[PDB]
Amino acid sequence: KTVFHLGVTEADLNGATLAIIPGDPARVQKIAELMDNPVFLASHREYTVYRAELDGQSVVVCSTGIGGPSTSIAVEELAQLGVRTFLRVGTTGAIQPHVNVGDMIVTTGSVRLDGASLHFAPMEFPAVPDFDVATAMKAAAQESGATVHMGVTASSDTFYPGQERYDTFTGRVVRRFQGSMKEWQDMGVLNFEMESATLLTMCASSGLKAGCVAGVIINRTQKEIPLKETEARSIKVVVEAARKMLK
Amino acid sequence: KTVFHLGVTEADLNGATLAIIPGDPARVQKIAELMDNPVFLASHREYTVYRAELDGQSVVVCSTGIGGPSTSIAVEELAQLGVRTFLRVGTTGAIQPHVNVGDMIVTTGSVRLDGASLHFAPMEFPAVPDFDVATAMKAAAQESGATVHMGVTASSDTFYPGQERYDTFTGRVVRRFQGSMKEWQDMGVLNFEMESATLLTMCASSGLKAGCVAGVIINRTQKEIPDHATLKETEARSIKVVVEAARKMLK
Amino acid sequence: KTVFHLGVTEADLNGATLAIIPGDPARVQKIAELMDNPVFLASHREYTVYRAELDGQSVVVCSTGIGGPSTSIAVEELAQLGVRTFLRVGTTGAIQPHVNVGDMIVTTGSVRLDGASLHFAPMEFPAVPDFDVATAMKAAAQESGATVHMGVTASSDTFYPGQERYDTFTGRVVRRFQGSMKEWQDMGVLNFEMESATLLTMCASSGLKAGCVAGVIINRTQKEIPDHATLKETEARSIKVVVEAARKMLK
Amino acid sequence: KTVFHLGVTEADLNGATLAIIPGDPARVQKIAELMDNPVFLASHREYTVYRAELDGQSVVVCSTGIGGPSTSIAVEELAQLGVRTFLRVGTTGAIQPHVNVGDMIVTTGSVRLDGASLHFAPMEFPAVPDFDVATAMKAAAQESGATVHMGVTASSDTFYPGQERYDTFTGRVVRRFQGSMKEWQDMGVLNFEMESATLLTMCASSGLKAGCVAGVIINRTQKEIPDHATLKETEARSIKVVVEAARKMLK
Amino acid sequence: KTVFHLGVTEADLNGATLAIIPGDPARVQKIAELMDNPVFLASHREYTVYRAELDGQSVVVCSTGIGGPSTSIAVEELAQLGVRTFLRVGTTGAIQPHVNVGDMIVTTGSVRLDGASLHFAPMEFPAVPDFDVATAMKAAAQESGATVHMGVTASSDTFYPGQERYDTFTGRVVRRFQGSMKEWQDMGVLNFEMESATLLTMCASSGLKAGCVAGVIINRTQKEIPDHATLKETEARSIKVVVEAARKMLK
Amino acid sequence: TKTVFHLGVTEADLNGATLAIIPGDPARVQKIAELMDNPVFLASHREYTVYRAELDGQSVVVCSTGIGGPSTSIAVEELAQLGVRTFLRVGTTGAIQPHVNVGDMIVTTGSVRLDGASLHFAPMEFPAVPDFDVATAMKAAAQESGATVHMGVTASSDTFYPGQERYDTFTGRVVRRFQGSMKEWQDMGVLNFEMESATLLTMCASSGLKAGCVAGVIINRTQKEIPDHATLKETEARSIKVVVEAARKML
Ligand SMILES: Cc1c[nH]c(=O)[nH]c1=O
Ligand SMILES: Cc1c[nH]c(=O)[nH]c1=O
Ligand SMILES: Cc1c[nH]c(=O)[nH]c1=O
Ligand SMILES: Cc1c[nH]c(=O)[nH]c1=O
C-alpha cells in the first residue's frame, strides 16, 4: 500500500519505527547524511522522505512543512507505515530574556494556539511529549555541551499575529493575541513555534511517542525578525536523541 | 526588504498586485507558463514563487503548502510586498451526490474547521470571499465549459479526522468530528479542503481580496473510480480557469 | 396546511415560492403595492402578510419583526408553506467613513453576533447569502443608480450594547463588546443590523435561498438622528430595489 | 426626552416606574383595561404602549415582540424613560408531565439558550429574577386559585430547533439541541419560552427589577394544539395575575 | 452501605432529610449544639458529620471543605443516604459599598466562576436556589433583626485570582479575571464566595433543594477593620439564622 | 512577619523551607512528616494541617490540601507567599487502563484539565504539565521502591462522581459533556483519574513554581466504581515513602 501524500510504501522504510521530522524539506538530506547509508525515497509537495541507518537500525527522515495541518498528514501516513516514534527538530524564537540565541529548548508541554490539535483531542487535553523522548532529547542536548532549557512552548497556527508580530501588512493583531507575548512571558513560556501543539497532542492521544527540540535563532525581547550554526547543532542533537531511543 | 520565508523583494514582483496561489509548489510553473514571460523568483520550503505577465500586467504565482498556517505566511509576506488580490486554485473532493468529478466549485463561504482563521478574526466572523473574485471565478469556470457549483466549503486543519476519515492508524475520530460529514452534507456543504477558511478570513478582515476555485477530483459519496483522462483534464481546466479569473480581475 | 404564528395557509400564498421579508410590519403594504394585485392576507403579532403578483407570478411579503428569533419563526413557517427564496430588505447603520448615508449595502457574509444562528449551525459555519440572490440584489441596487457596497455586516442580537452604544440607561457595555466597533471597522465590516446572521445561517444550512440588501440611514461615525427627507428617499429606493431583485430571481 | 423605537416620551408615561411587558401587541390593551384610565400612547413595529393607573400610581404596558433582541430594545428604552421594574407575562409550553395545561409558572431562573443575554453579561452570570418580583408573582398566582410552579425555564432564541421540534421544513435539529428536551426534563426544567433569559439577565445586571409569570397553554409531552376555551381561560387569568403582582410591587 | 468519603450509613442519619452544610469542620459541632441531642457521627478529611434534632426531627450537619469539588462529594453522598434539602451557611466578604459588616446575604443566583457546576449542567443553566429555601432563609435572616440583601453572588474556584486579588506571590491575575471585580460590582453582584455555584447548580439539576445564606464579615470596598465584637456577633447570628431557616423547612 | 490567611503559619515557622510535600488528607501529614527528621506540628485550620520537618539537614514543609483544586490553590499560594518554590503532590487514584494494577504508581506527565481553578491561572490552551525535574525525581523514587511505575496523562476532575463518569449515584445520570468520557480518555491513552493535578500543575507551571504528582492506584475502573477501602493501606504506605525519596532527590 502507498499512502496518499508521502509517496512511500512500508517496504521502502525497511522496518523503520522511528522518524526524525524537520520542517524544511531541504533539511532532510542533511539529517540523513549524519547517519549511515542515506537513501532518497520520495519528494512530493513539502514532503521529502529519506531513510538511513543508525547503529544498524533503519530510521526515516521526513519533512513536515510548516504548521500542524501539514505535519498531521505526515505523522498519520508514517504511522500507517509502522512508525511509532517521532522526533521533531526545528528553529524557534525565545521569549524569555535569559534564553540566548544558540540555546536549545526541549518542550515539556505546548500552549495549544493551533487548530489541528483539536482534531485529535479536546482543548483540556495536554499537549505533552512522551517522557522517554523528552528524556532522550534533554540528554542528547546536554551531552552536546549546549545550554538547554526544559519548559513550555507556545505553539501557534501563524508566524505573525499569533506570535504577536506587528511589523506586518496590517500592523494589527486580533484581540485574542493582543498582549499575548507578555502574558506568555509572565507565565514562564520559553519560546514560540508552529507545530508542537499538533504533533504532541496527536501523538499523546494516538499511542505514538513524540518530542520536540529546537534551536533558538532569535530572542523576541530583542527584535521581531531573524542561524547556520544553531541549525547544524540542532540536527546533531536530534540524531543523538534518536540513538538514545533505539532498542 | 527581503521577506523572511518567501525570499523575494518588492522589486522582484515588478509591480504585481495580484497573486495566484496554488497549494503544490510543482503547480506554480504550470500556472505561470499559461501567462507571458514567466520567471522563477525563489524556492524556499514549500514556497515556490514565479512572476509573469497577463495582458501587460505583472502577476505573481506562489505556492502555499498544505494548511492555513503555511498559507497565512505566504499571503502576509506577499501583502507586505504590495499584493492585494489572491486567487486560490486547487483540486478537491466533493461530499454531495450531485457534484461530479470534473466539476468546479467556487466557494461562497467556508466552515472554519481550522485554527489560523482565529488569528485574524473571532469565530463569529464569516470566512467569505471578495464578491468580485467569486464572480470572476464563476464566469471563468462557466466559460471553460465546466459544470460549476457555488456554495459552502468545509475547511479543515486535518486531512483525516477533520474530514471524518476512519481508514487511519487509530481508526478513531474525536467526538467533535464524529457524525460531522453527514451534518455538513445535510447542511448543503459541497466539499472539504484545508486552506480556504484561513485564506478567506485573513483576507476579508485585512483589506485583501480573495477567492477560491477548485476542480473536483473525488466524490466521497461515489464508490466508482474516476478515469485518468478525466483527472488530467480537470487539473488542466482548473489552472486555465484561475488564469482567466485573474484576467477578469485585472480588467 | 396551517402554521402556528403567521395565520396564513398554503392556499393563501397562491403558489408563491419567493418572499420579500422586511422587518417593519408597516413596510409590508408599501412593498406589496409596488407589485400587481396586492392583497392583505393576515396580521398577527409582528407578522403582517400580503401577497402580490410580479410578472404574473405570486410573491409573498411578510414582516419579520426585530431580531433573529422572530425572523426564524417567519422563515420556518413560510418554508412550511412552500417558500424557498427569501429577500431581506431593511435599514442599517454604517460604520465605515467611506459609506455614506443613502448608500446601499448588499451583505456578502455576516458576523454572527446573534444567538439564533447557533440553533441551525455551529459558529464555524459561515452566515453567507445565496450567490444568485446576492448577485440579483447587487444588480438591482446598481441599476437603480445607487452607490452600492458589497461586504460584511455585523449582525447583533441587541441594538445597544452589541452595537457598542454608550448613550444608554447604564452607559455600560459588557467586556465582549468593549472596543468592538473599532475592531469591526478595522476588519472592514460595513454596517450593523439585527437579523442577517440568523436569516443567512438558517437558510444556507436548510436548502433555502436568502440574501439581504439595506439602505444606509445613519453612519455611526457621524450622527444618530436621520434627516427625514433623506431617510424617506433611501427607504423608497430600497423597496424598489428589492422588488427588482425579486424580478431577477423569478424563473 | 425621546427614544429610538417606542415612540413615546418620558412625559407620556406620567411618572411610571413599573411596566407590564407582554409579548403580543394585541394583549397590551387587554392588560391596560384591567387598570384605571388606560390610554393608548403609541404603536410602532411590534411595540404597542399604553399607560394606566393602579392604586393611583402610573403604570406602563408595553409589548416586547418575540425574542430577546426585540425585548432588549423595549426594556432599554423604557429604562431610559424612568421605568425600573418589569413584569413579564406570557404563554408557555410545559415540558414536565406533572405540569398541567392551565397551570402557571413563575420563573426562578432561566437556561440561557439565547444570544442577547450575552450582550449584558457573560454566560456564567445567572438569568435570575428579582426576588421581590418573583415573590409577588407567586402570591398573585396562588391567590387567583391557580396551580403554581416555581422553577427553571429554558429560554430559547428559536421556537423550533432550540425547543427540539422536529415537525418542521427540514425535520432536522442541530447537534447542540438533539436530545435537549430530555436533558432539560431530567434536570427539572419546567417549560420553554423565548424572552426570559434576555430579560432577566439584562435586568439583573443593570439595576432593574424583573420577573416572569406564564400560563401553560400546551404540554410538550401531550399535544401541540390547544383547546380554545381552556386557552382563553388561562390567558385571562394570567393577565389578572400580572396586574395583581404589579399591585403588590407598588405597595 | 457506608458512603466512601463521609463514612456514615443511612441508619446513622436517623431519618434526616435535611442537612446544614457549613464549610469549616470546626463549625459543625457549634451548629449541632444549637439543636437538641447533638451526636457526633464521623470525621474524615474535611468532613465532620453530626446529627441533631430540631422540633423532634432529625437534621444532619456536615462540613463541605473549601470549594465546589469537596462540596460536591458531601452533597452526593448525603443524597445517597436520603438527604434532599441542603442549607449552606457561612460568613462572607461583600463587594458593594452599601453592604455592611454584620448584614446577611441570601443568594438568589450565582455567577458560575467554578468548574464543578459544569459537571452537572452546561454553563447556560442558572445556578439558582430552591425558592422555598431562599424564602425560608430570607425570613429567618430578617426575623433575626439583621439587614438582609437578596442578590447575586460570584462563586469562584479560587480565593486569589478569581476574586481579583493582587496581594499574592506573583501579583498576576490572568486576563479572564483582570477588571472582573469592577465588572461584577457594576452588575450589582453582592459578594464573592467559593461553593454556591457548584451547590446550587448540582442541586437545581438533580432534584435536590438548596440555598445559601451568609453573614458579611468584611467589605472589599471599605478601608476600616471591623471590631472583634461585631465579627463574633455576625458569626453567631449566621448559624442561628440557618437553624431557624431549617426549622421553617421542616414538614 | 505576616501570617497567611488560611494556613495560620508565618515564614519564620517554616525555618527556611523551600519545598513542600502536599497530600490531600490532613491525617496523612503527620505520617509523611514522621518519615523525616524532627517533625513539628505548626497549625491546623479547616482542611489545612501543616508540619515542618528536616530532610538531609534541610527544612521541608508538609501541608494537606483538602480535596479539589480550589482548596489546593489556597495552600499552594499561601506556601509560595512564605517562600516555598517546589511542591510534591502524593495521593490515591483510579486507573482507567486495564494493564494498570492496584498498587502500581503513576507519575503524571500532563493532566486533562477537567477542573475550573486551572482557568484562574492560565487559559485552557496552556498545558497542565509538571516540572521536568520533579517528574524525573518521582519516577526514580517510585522505581527504586520496587513499585511498578507508569508515566503518562492523568484526567483531573472537579468531581469524584459525574466527572469520572460514575453512575452508581443518587441521580444515576451524567451530564452530556461527560457521557462516554471514560472510554474516550481510555482510547486516548489516559492512565487515571484524580482531582487536583490540573489545578496544581497549571498554577505552578504558570507561576514560576516547580510541581509534580505521584499517585498510588487503589482501584481499576475497568473493574468497578468504588474502592474496597482496605486496599488503601500498603499502597498508601509505599506512596509516602516514594514522595519523601523524591523530595530528597529534589534537595
Ligand atoms: C525564529 C522562529 C521560528 N519559528 C517560529 O514559529 N517563530 C520564530 O520566531
Ligand atoms: C480529495 C481531497 C483533496 N483535499 C482535501 O482536503 N480533501 C479531499 O478529500
Ligand atoms: C440605523 C440602524 C438600524 N438597525 C441596526 O441594527 N442598527 C442601526 O444603527
Ligand atoms: C406554547 C409555547 C409558547 N412559547 C414558546 O416559546 N414555546 C411553546 O411551546
Ligand SMILES: Cc1c[nH]c(=O)[nH]c1=O
Ligand atoms: C472574606 C471572604 C471569604 N470567602 C471568600 O471566598 N472571599 C472573601 O473575600
Ligand SMILES: Cc1c[nH]c(=O)[nH]c1=O
Ligand atoms: C480511587 C480514586 C481516588 N481519587 C479520585 O479522584 N478518583 C478515584 O477513583
Ligand code: NA
Ligand atoms: Na505546510
Ligand code: NA
Ligand atoms: Na421581534
Ligand code: NA
Ligand atoms: Na476542599
